[PDB]
């Protein structure tokens, strides 16, 4: 993902 979640706005981290 980006950082910990996979989202294209990284959401539920």
């Known amino acids: 993902x980006c950082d ?3 989202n294209p ?3 539920x981290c």
């Open 4 to 6: 910990v979640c996979c």
């Open 9 to 11: 706005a990284c959401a």
